[PDB]
């Protein structure tokens, strides 16, 4: 819920720095001749940057001195066939980049096979002017590089087609992670009105780096493989490493945890990484249900919680839930519903963004006011 | 030891720990590049069928590197 | 805990009979049933599940009905191999997971035309005499009817609470049995004595058929 | 797929014993594991089982308190402590495989293992003793005369009794055990052969009793 306190950036400044750079007077006769020897090299830039360059593809030398040697000699009539279907090889792949580049506006996400193919990725990713682990992760997670990467068309001259594939450099690996899950917590009352309810708002992604805590707030901006967790430093607030003491205490004073309150009496579910948490208010039909032997509970009103073990489905309503089927360990911390602190008829109603001590503080200005009388 | 998750029914609330991280700091630009030929565009006799389908094939080439050039 | 009922203890039936045993419960286990068939000195082998879903390899002579308390487990063509221990098991909510009682199934025995008991005796041993006991040993083999008379008999005196009976199963190749009956003493009761006897009654035999030998 | 048991033996009423099962050929890590014993010559009876994580066991009421189970994933182990042990203990013990993979409710056994025999009898073990039943001298010349071994005086059960180690089978009757007024077990195996053969081929039973460790070849001679 806090993605509108992140700043915004160009995610594809500096494959278009590259471009820019490219097109001046003699770069691409400079790369030519470069890759004139081998099918990659290393380019010192005119803007002083050294960058990998790559020769996926020779078609001028198959048209030269393959196709239309033979085709303009003698008798134009060609005797073989199966060079018509040599050449349709070798050529699919310039057509379908040259449509990928047309549909998305010379500037393509995810990075196809026919940008750029797995041997070539490897080795691109091998040859890259970072630490071996870099190496290893980059190369076992190829997909997931894939999905974090660019490829812009940037010039065709010169009998040159190039294009930047600007890939991700993955600096902080192997610290800490852990997802925030959050729910409504309302109170359980049978009145149909004087009902408040509390939410916390910092839910997503928080991983350690260099001493702070990176949050994400949009977790959807972040991929999962087996216990790893793929995000952007771009779409991440840097908070200090006390913001995790919010879920040992949530009225802890070094830091201020952010909630939202409200009186909407919604029943919802929120499948977390082994479990779900069930808000289950008014008269809703909410039911933890086993594949293979159906109903195994049904729900209290409140705020409760099921582990992923020996529990299938989730219904809420008429909304059904399928729980992750991941292995773990799941705690159950005991505790009194923090809503059952506050009084119904002194409790802010409605505050989108706030935090604990704001809620308190505008809580001790309402009881200063009325304790005047 | 492996994923954990602990509930906290106080604030209503699960946080899932056991993750590790890789977290994009930065970018590396490589240029990719494609050789291409400037091929004569004509003279030969579209009477074969084999003939005919290269023709064909090399109208496609050269409108791709059009259809590149227009990408400007 | 629910208490499960198989009906019947135990059958006798031919090859190639339809065999219907049964199994009830205390209470209602809907489906959570499973039907296993232990062979003769085997393991138990899950012949179903969910009360009629069959396992997979299973031969589709079996066949599993029911519901609610009752089912019912049917071989159509009773074979061989089918012999054994059956037993019906429920699974219900959180495992106190209670068997039947299980259910055997035989073979009908063989016809066999009567054959008359071969008799042997065999005196106790030298090595085991030092030892201080001894041990008459009296044998009957590939004899049918299945019933005998085995009588001990030491200086025309008949014994009496000191022999024991062993007796083979029906053989699978001339349908016939052997039995041993062992009598035992001590040194100074065996020495205490002259002559030892078996007498053998039994229906292939005209007289009692007595096998006697002297110490020594 | 695979489960091997041991722990096995005769162990005196009172005195503990750990029975362990090892697994090969599937992933032991995602399934329950059942402990279902039987008694010498009745039926099948429930007596643990263990989750596939290891954090749910549950005991049949007959052994609630006194046995207890455990498991270990990395070495594809299931361990049953039983203390404590009454004489109707004595049984044989199967480890066993849950059908259904990954869950918290227990279904039913699919794969069995072999079994491990346990007797709680105050009696000792002991190897048995084998005597020659010889043959007459007084067989006709044809003459189908009779020889044997008599296995005496061995606990627990079972002994295992072939002819020249297998190479003689037809007319070979092996009896079942008696259990005699001492408390211990013994048996016969008999054999029917040409008298003719008598004093040409060799007659040796070969008598094997794995609970004392016990191997005797007896030569049977006129």
């Known amino acids: 819920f806090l993605g509108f306190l992140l700043g915004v950036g160009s995610a594809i400044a500096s494959g278009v720095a590259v471009c820019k750079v490219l097109h001046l007077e003699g770069e691409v006769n400079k790369i030519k001749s470069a890759l004139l020897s081998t099918n990659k090299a290393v380019v010192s830039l005119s803007n002083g940057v050294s960058v990998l360059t790559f020769k996926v593809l020779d078609l001028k030398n198959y048209i030269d001195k393959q196709l239309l040697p033979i085709l303009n000699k003698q008798s134009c009539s060609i005797s073989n066939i199966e060079t018509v279907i040599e050449f349709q090889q070798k050529n699919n792949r310039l057509l379908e980049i040259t449509r990928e580049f047309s549909v998305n506006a010379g500037v393509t996400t995810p990075v196809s096979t026919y940008m750029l193919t797995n041997s070539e990725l490897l080795s691109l990713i091998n040859d890259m002017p970072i630490t071996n682990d870099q190496k290893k992760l980059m190369s076992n997670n190829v997909q997931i590089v894939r999905q974090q990467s660019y490829s812009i068309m940037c010039i065709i001259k010169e009998e040159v087609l190039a294009y930047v594939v600007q890939l991700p450099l993955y600096g902080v690996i192997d610290t800490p992670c852990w997802k925030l899950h959050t729910s409504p917590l309302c109170t359980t009352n049978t009145k149909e009105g004087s009902n408040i309810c509390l939410t916390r708002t910092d839910r997503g992604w928080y991983c350690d780096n260099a001493g702070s805590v990176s949050f994400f707030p949009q977790a959807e901006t972040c991929k999962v493989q087996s216990n790893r967790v793929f995000c952007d430093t771009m779409n991440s607030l840097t908070l200090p490493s006390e913001v995790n003491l919010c879920n040992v205490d949530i009225f802890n004073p070094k830091y201020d945890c952010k909630i939202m309150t409200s009186k909407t009496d919604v029943s919802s579910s929120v499948i977390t990484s082994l479990g779900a948490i069930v808000s289950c208010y008014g008269k809703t039909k909410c039911t933890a249900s086993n594949k293979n032997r159906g109903i195994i509970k049904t729900f209290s009103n409140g705020c409760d919680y099921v582990s992923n073990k020996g529990v299938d489905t989730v219904s809420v309503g008429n909304t059904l839930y399928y729980v992750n089927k991941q292995e773990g360990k799941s705690l159950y911390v005991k505790g009194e519903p923090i809503i059952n602190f506050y009084d119904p008829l002194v409790f802010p109603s409605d505050e989108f963004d706030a935090s604990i001590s704001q809620v308190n503080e505008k809580i001790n200005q309402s009881l200063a006011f009325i304790r005047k009388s | 030891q492996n994923i954990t998750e602990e509930f906290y029914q106080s604030t209503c609330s699960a946080v899932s720990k056991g993750y590790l991280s890789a977290l994009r700091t930065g970018w590396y630009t490589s240029v990719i590049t494609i050789e291409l030929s400037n091929i004569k565009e004509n003279k030969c006799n579209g009477t074969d069928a084999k003939v005919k389908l290269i023709k064909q094939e090399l109208d496609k080439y050269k409108n791709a590197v059009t259809e590149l050039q227009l990408l400007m | 805990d629910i208490q499960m009922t198989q009906s019947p203890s135990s059958l006798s039936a031919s090859v190639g009979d339809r065999v219907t045993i049964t199994c009830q419960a205390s209470q209602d286990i809907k489906k959570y049933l499973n039907w296993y068939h232990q062979k003769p000195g085997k393991v138990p082998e899950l012949l179903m599940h969910?009360?009629?879903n069959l396992e997979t390899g299973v031969p589709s002579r079996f066949s599993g009905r029911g519901s609610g308390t009752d089912f019912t487990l049917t071989i159509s063509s009773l074979q061989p191999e089918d012999i054994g221990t059956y037993y019906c098991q429920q699974y219900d909510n959180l495992p106190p997971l209670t068997f039947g009682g299980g259910t055997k199934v035989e073979i009908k025995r063989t016809v066999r035309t009567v054959a008359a008991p071969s008799v042997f005796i065999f005196p106790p041993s030298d090595e085991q005499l030092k030892s201080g006991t001894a041990s008459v040993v009296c044998l009957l083999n590939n004899f049918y009817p299945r019933e005998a008379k085995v009588q001990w008999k030491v200086d025309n005196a008949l014994q009496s609470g000191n022999s024991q009976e062993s007796v083979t199963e029906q053989d699978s190749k001339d349908s016939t049995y052997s039995l041993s009956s062992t009598l035992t003493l001590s040194k100074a009761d065996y020495e205490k004595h002259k002559v030892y006897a078996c007498e053998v009654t039994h229906q292939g035999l005209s007289s009692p058929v007595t096998k006697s030998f002297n110490r020594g | 797929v695979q489960l091997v048991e041991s722990g096995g033996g005769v162990v005196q009423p009172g005195r503990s014993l750990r029975l362990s099962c090892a697994a090969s050929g599937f992933s032991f890590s995602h399934y329950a594991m059942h402990w279902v014993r039987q008694a010498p010559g009745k039926g099948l009876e429930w007596v643990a089982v263990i989750s596939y994580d290891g954090e749910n066991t549950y005991y049949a009421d007959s052994v609630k308190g006194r046995f207890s189970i455990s498991r270990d994933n990395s070495k594809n182990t299931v361990s049953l402590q039983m203390n404590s042990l009454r004489p109707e203990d004595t049984a044989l013990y199967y480890c066993?495989?849950?059908?259904?993979?990954?869950?918290?409710?227990?279904?039913?056994?699919?794969?069995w293992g072999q079994g491990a025999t346990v007797t709680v009898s105050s009696a000792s073990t002991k190897g048995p003793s084998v005597f020659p039943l010889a043959p007459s001298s007084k067989s006709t010349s044809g003459g189908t005369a009779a020889l044997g071994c008599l296995v005496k005086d061995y606990f627990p059960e079972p002994v295992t009794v072939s002819w020249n180690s297998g190479a003689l089978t037809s007319g070979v009757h092996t009896f079942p055990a008696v259990l005699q007024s001492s408390g211990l077990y013994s048996l016969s195996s008999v054999v029917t052969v040409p008298s003719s053969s008598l004093g040409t081929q060799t007659y040796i039973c070969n008598v094997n009793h794995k609970p004392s460790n016990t191997k005797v070849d007896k030569k049977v001679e006129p």
């Open positions: 969910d009360a009629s």
């Open positions: 066993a495989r849950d059908r259904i993979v990954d869950d918290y409710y227990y279904y039913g056994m699919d794969v």
